[PDB]
Amino acid sequence: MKVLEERNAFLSDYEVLKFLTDLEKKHLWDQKSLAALKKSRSKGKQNRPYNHPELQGITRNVVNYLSINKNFINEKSGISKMSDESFAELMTKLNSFKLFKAEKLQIVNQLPANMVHLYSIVEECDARFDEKTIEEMLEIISGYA
Amino acid sequence: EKAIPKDQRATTPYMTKYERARILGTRALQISMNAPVFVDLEGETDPLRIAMKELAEKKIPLVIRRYLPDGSFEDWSVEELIV
Amino acid sequence: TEGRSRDGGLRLGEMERDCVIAYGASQLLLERLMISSDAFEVDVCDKCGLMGYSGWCTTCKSAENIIKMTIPYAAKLLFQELLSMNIAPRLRLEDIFQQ
Amino acid sequence: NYMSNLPFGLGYGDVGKNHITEFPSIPLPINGPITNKERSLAVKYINFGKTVKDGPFYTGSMTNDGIERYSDKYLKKRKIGISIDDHPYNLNLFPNELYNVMGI
Amino acid sequence: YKGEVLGITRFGLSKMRDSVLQLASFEKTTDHLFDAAFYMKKDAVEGVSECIILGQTMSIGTGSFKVVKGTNISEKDLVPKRCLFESLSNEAALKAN
Amino acid sequence: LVTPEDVMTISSLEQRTLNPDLFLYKELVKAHLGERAASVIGMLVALGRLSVRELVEKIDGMDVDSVKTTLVSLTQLRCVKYLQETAISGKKTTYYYYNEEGIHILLYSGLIIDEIITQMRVNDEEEHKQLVAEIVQNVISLGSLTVEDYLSSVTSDSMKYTISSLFVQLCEMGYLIQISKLHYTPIEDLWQFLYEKHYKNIPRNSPLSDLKKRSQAKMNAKTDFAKIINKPNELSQILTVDPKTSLRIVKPTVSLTINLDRFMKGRRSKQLINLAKTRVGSVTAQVYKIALRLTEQKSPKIRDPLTQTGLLQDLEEAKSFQDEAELVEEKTPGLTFNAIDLARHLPAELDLRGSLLSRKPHSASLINSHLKILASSNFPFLNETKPGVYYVPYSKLMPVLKSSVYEYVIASTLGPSAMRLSRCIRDNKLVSEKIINSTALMKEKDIRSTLASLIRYNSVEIQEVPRTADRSASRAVFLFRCKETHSYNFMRQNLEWNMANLLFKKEKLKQENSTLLKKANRDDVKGRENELLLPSELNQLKMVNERELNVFARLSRLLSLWEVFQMA
Amino acid sequence: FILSKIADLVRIPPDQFHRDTISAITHQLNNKFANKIIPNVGLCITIYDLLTVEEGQLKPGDGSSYINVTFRAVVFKPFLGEIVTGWISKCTAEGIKVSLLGIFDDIFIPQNMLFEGCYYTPEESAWIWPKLYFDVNEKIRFRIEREVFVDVKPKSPKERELEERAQEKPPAYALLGSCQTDGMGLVSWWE
Amino acid sequence: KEVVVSETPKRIKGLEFSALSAADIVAQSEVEVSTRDLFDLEKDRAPKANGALDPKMGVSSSSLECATCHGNLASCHGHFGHLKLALPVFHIGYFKATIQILQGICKNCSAILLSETDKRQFLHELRRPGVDNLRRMGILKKILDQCKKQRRCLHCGALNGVVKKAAAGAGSAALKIIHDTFRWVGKKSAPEKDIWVGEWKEVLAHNPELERYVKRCMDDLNPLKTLNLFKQIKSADCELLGIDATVPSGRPETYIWRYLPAPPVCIRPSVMSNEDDLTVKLTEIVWTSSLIKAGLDKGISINNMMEHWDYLQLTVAMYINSDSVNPAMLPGSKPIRGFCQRLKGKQGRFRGNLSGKRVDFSGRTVISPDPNLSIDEVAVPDRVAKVLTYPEKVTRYNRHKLQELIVNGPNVHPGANYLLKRNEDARRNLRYGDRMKLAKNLQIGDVVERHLEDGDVVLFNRQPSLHRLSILSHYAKIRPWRTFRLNECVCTPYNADFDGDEMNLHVPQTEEARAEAINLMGVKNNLLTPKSGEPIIAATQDFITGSYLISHKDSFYDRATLTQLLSMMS
DNA sequence: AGGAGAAGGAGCAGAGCG
DNA sequence: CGCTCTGCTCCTTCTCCTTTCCT
Ligand SMILES: [Mg+2]
Ligand SMILES: [Zn+2]
Ligand SMILES: [Zn+2]
Ligand SMILES: [Zn+2]
């Protein structure tokens, strides 16, 4: 019952969508089961593994939240439909612009495409750099959507 | 606390009466609480007799942990111990 | 009860439990001497070895170190009588599992 | 009947009820008002007991997160620590066993 | 077995039993319990008498070994995993500092 | 009604079980050092002498390192002793003790600073007061100190003489001694070491008998013990040295500590003055105030010559200590004094002119009158060697001081009828109830009530006398005694417990109210907390500080109360 | 979101022996840690992986396999340098409570740290600025300054009985933030 | 909200014995027993608010409520009270321990009568890594002899004599301790003796009758004086006495009666009313304590007050153990049942209710023979087989047979008696309720309590149980008569002789108990006695004489006789 | 009962003494 | 050299514990 490690590697808001989407794909996918599917499995009429209500509800709420538009703008999120290669190949500009932090996860999902949003993403963002590496980050991290 | 390795084990390889009775009782409990079995049933309802049949056919999925007085132990299965 | 008229249970005495020990039968002793005679659930504190009630310590008013377990009702009664003199039989608990 | 007994100075009305206050009732004359001398004595007592606790010989203890940003940088350090090694120790007064923990 | 001839009486039975519960179960119950209270005798519950009194499982016979059920679980499907992840965090400042 | 649950919170029945010695020492070290020091000190006091591995095995903390750090801190504060002994069969195992006199410095710190400030007579110069206060504060708060460390702990290019000339003045008055291994060594163990090596170098099969050999070892180790004990107490060779073209300056290398014995002697002088003020005039006691201060520096040791703790008392020969005490207290040349000596040190304010009525300029004939008054008083305040010679008989004045303080505590707590009955039974011996009525003239019902209220403490003992073979309480006649030793024993434990309780209450209050002291530390508590608004916070700070000051005042009064019983 | 590492004891009933060992371990783990707060680490969401599984041990009366297992779960716990959106539902004159999307609404962002020119209008007016205000069911942004926990439950049985006769701590996971810098409040303020 | 919760199984590891420190006794209470009236009578014998039967400590019947955790005689575990005493009194369980503590310490300063090196050696001997009770008792006794040998306190130089207890009788003056200070000083002059004679000179002058009683009058240790001495014993020397001073209540002062815990009413229930001895005795305790408290402030006679204080001693002494052989000291007055009497004897707690009990699912009737009964089998009457159910859990392999048993119902022998669903708690009696639909709605996790059938494992027993073959596990066989039947071959292990002999039957109620019974105590597995290894189950008188007559040399059989004999054999 | 255990006495060689 | 301690060794008085239970 003991908690061993308080925090492992930061599970950024990129895999927290893929894992939940795969879980829903494996059991209780509602994108096509709403058509009145009546597949019988194990002879009980349940026809689904893991009827578990609590996990299904919370995973639906997380997938719904990450499917709603990422709220840097007022219609997808920009992370729900993120190609896997994109996360591994848009890393180049983020790493080249040495922010000197671990806020790479902060930008990949929240507040691209604005100046005030990028400014409030990090502290004294104007003071640290205001010459060329604000518009570059905006045009890179906003170029996905 | 540690486990005596498989290559060097110094205990008897003959199953004992106590080990046999405990194995049968535990398996009977497991079956009576609706566990899958691994022998052709024929016509039988008793978990005890199903367990006896499984033991005779050598198909019980349990292992025995033997505790020496110092505190180490060895692991013997039911398909290894003989009678 | 023990009446000839009531549903008087049959006594499994000292000699009989000695025979059953000699056969080496532990679970049968458990069944015949606790389960089918007087099995009682109790709550015991883990920092002090004292039985509580309803998940409450009633000696260190916490309800945070309470553990449930089954003991003979005669054992419960003996512990309460021992506390009624100036004897405090503190019970120490250990985990069954964890190797 | 165990209720027949009764002392002379006691009537039936007084006995039959066990009541021990269990709260103290006889004070000491030392809890009067304060005096200026005792006031200044308390002030120096307060300065003591405080100076030692803020001193090196404490041995008292029986969000430091891992995330790194610029807030951690140029952050005013709360305190400049001290150790057992700092204070000058006369080696004769201490047994040999304890030399390892002190800075030789 | 303890270097001297100890009988099978109550006085002899204080040989190596060291168990207040079973000594009280046998004879001179209150004397033993009061002595255990005074000297703070701190016995362990390992003897068969204490096992019965507390309704625990004996350590002899069928209670002298442990039954264990093999989990039958492979080993290569227990590796840690995170897909296309570690490109950013550590390497964000792996140069110029 | 009050339920048992409410009892455990309001009333102190939880603390009524704790031992007074363990409670007070543990609370003191927890207040001044912390939780690890309290753990180690509590384990030492509860179990006794222990080693480091035993300390690790006992205390939950199994980190030897933590134990070693706690032990070095406790040794620097000299709250512990050590005895590094070697076993003949092999290796050597050190051992640790709890220092009674080390903790009593924490228990007496404010009083110690008070005495050092007042005795230097630096009331004239302000900076002198701050200087001596800082010296004594730093010494007590650091354990041991050197003049080199103190001088390097000041800004350079200054007048080091101003901060060093009083240091030698401190060392010359006995308020500062050098520290050696005898301070960290048990007295009885030292006596055991010295008693041998004198019973071992005896010739084999010597003509002297075994009793004669043991006696020879006793009186041949007593001299070495006395030499070793008196060495650090009074040997001014450290301050006697003098570097060229310089003043009398102490040796840099020697490390200094407080001298608890001198402070205890000063406390005894204060108690004697305050008790004398209750039997003679203020003018007579004014001279007694300076008579006691003159002989204070050379006064005999107060609690013990360290020789009662050193061994078995004797077969019957504590008379060999009583006689030596009388011999020292009289035949000390400093202790003996005449009416001429008191003239010079007499206060300037005192006049002595009209204080005396014969038949019903600081003249020596005035002093002799008051000293004769002191000798004539029922309390042996002074005694005369020869007509004109004077000395204070401590061997006979301490029992009367103890008995008077005890009976006045009884008067202030229980009834004046209780005081009268206690003195009646003490003056008498084995007095029966009828005789109590006869020689006390008080109603028997009231006498019985007060006797019962007095037996709840170890003040009146009952001596049964049975008239039948079976000691029935109907056929027996009951007597009474006083048993002064039991009564003083109970009185000191009660006061010690109450001091422990007060310190515990203060710590609890600070624990509950540290939430404001945090903001106080944030905003520079001294004088600025008004500017931070929060009038509720300021009022709470005010009443908690008032409670703290009251706690300290009551603590000091309790100290003065138990001092006399702590004597022997 | 972060990843943890927790050891535990998991009991597998004989009914589920037919299933895969990992497929039953994950099921009991999900039962235990479905949508619940683990004290002093945050609110767990979902078991992510499984790293250590001991051999199942049986006690003398149950017949089930008791297994020690260590795993890495998915937990929601931002610290300081975070930014979370959402919409506000319920407001009261003690501060403003903004909601998530059906995960938890136990976050309380005070009015005093909300920008500068804001105050509570009891005239049914949403807010006041000295020059724009938000209202219910509109997009917002904020931060968290300090995260607090509460785990108190010392209810004696008599206290339980009296409470039941007469009939608060909903949140065991409470967060507090601020809205000082421009950019928060609402993203549709601009553009 | 919805925090995680955990439940880890736990095992008993060991008992640890001590005494309660009079702060634990108060932490242990819900009320204080102040009055002497059991019932207020203003509400028809409703118990008093602060009396011996105060409802806060539980209820004695099932029609009431316990006012702490509201529950009847069933669901209420029980709660304690406390009972403060006006004057300290001895604890008869710890009386000799109090004597032993006194004999080892100084009676003036309460320092242990040992030397620092001597006590260091004893301490080293006590803490040796391998030391058991026998070695510890030996070392402690040696310490006792050494301190009894010491003559003068090393700290205060006082005088210490023998500290025996005043021995006058079992009941009267038994709990009195006398210190004989001047026993070891003979032909010597000591300050203690001089002070003694100086004290005694005054009394005789005023009272010339005590000249006869000049002797005796030892230093008596009353409970209050003894308590005040024990509060000063240092902690560092508690180990040498037999006390662990590391923990609170590890103290010699906690073995003196100053608070009496008031037992739960569960322990002392009110029968159908009539009270019991424990409650009566504690009412008497409250009575005498209140008398002492009221009289102390009234200045009642010291001779009178000490006579009551001695009476309160014997009252709490007889409530812990009935040992006042001469009860004539009690004006009201040894068959009373104290706490000690509730644990001793053949019929006490240990030998009557803990190591040996009375069990459910058992029967007893006369035995009869049955040759056609196989050995390994016992024949059970149908009448007792219809009441001795075995609880069979529904498990996907017996659902059909279980619902057939439910349909048959308790009336027929192949039937069931109770039903217990998974989610529900109480058992549904099958004597009523249209068992036809219950059998249809039977699910795969319920438990059916069905009659004893052919093949069920049971235990069989005869008394007295000399060797282990007095109880053997058989197989059941339902039969039309009333006796228990067994094959005459297995009569030898029981020592049975069908002359009116009765035997006991037990039906194990769990799978594990069943399997161990049949696999370890089964007749086929116990054909050989373990005292020699020789057969014990074999032929008997007629089974032997018939075999001999068959195999005699004079016996010749044709084919018809041969084949009939073989058919009879099978 | 019998049957050992245990706590207090009572005389006694021993060993040191001036 | 009797005397006088310190210590055995011997002895007397004082409680505990006695079988299957059979409902
Ligand atoms: Mg017969
Ligand atoms: Zn507790
Ligand atoms: Zn209750
Ligand atoms: Zn003493």
Author numbering:
A (entry chain D): 1 to 74, 91 to 161
B (entry chain F): 71 to 153
C (entry chain B): 1051 to 1149
D (entry chain Q): 14 to 75, 101 to 142
E (entry chain A): 1364 to 1460
F (entry chain O): 25 to 384, 447 to 654
G (entry chain G): 2 to 131, 137 to 173, 189 to 212
H (entry chain A): 2 to 273, 280 to 340, 348 to 584
Report text from the authors:
The yeast Ty1 retrotransposon integrates upstream of genes transcribed by RNA polymerase III (Pol III). Pol III transcribes short genes encoding for untranslated RNAs such as transfer RNAs (tRNA), the 5S ribosomal RNA (rRNA) and the U6 spliceosomal RNA. Pol III is composed of 17 subunits that are organized into four architectural units. We report cryo-EM structures of Pol III in complex with IN1, revealing a 16-residue segment at the IN1 C-terminus that contacts Pol III subunits AC40 and AC19, an interaction that we validate by in vivo mutational analysis.
In parallel, we formed a Pol III complex with a transcription bubble mimetic comprising an 11-nucleotide mismatched DNA region, where one of the mismatched strands is hybridized to a 10-nucleotide RNA molecule (inset). Interestingly, IN1 is capable of interacting with this Pol III-DNA complex as with free Pol III, suggesting that the interaction may occur at the periphery of this multi-protein enzyme. This preparation was employed to obtain the cryo-EM structure of the Pol III-DNA complex bound to IN1 at 3.1 Å resolution. Additionally, residues R698 and Y701 in C128 switch their conformation to allow access of the C11 acidic loop, comprising residues 88-93 that are involved in RNA cleavage, into the active site (inset). Strikingly, focused classification of the Pol III-DNA bound to IN1 dataset showed that virtually all particles contain C11-Ct in the pore. In the structure of Pol III-DNA bound to IN1, the Pol III bridge helix presents a straight conformation, associated to a conformational change in the nearby C11 acidic loop, while the trigger loop is fully ordered and retracted. In yeast Pol II, an equivalent configuration with a straight bridge helix and a locked trigger loop has been observed in the reactivated intermediate of backtracking complexed with TFIIS30. Residue E92 in C11-Ct further coordinates MgB in the presence of nucleic acids, while its side chain is more flexible in their absence. In our structures, the C11 N-terminal Zn-ribbon (C11-Nt) is located between the C160 jaw, the C128 lobe and subunit C37, in an equivalent position to that observed in our Pol III-DNA structure and reported structures in the absence of IN112. We were able to model the entire C11 linker (residues 37-63) when C11-Ct is ordered, independent of the presence of nucleic acids. However, compared to the pre-termination complex, Pol III-DNA bound to IN1 exhibits an additional short strand and an open funnel that enables access of C11-Ct into the pore.
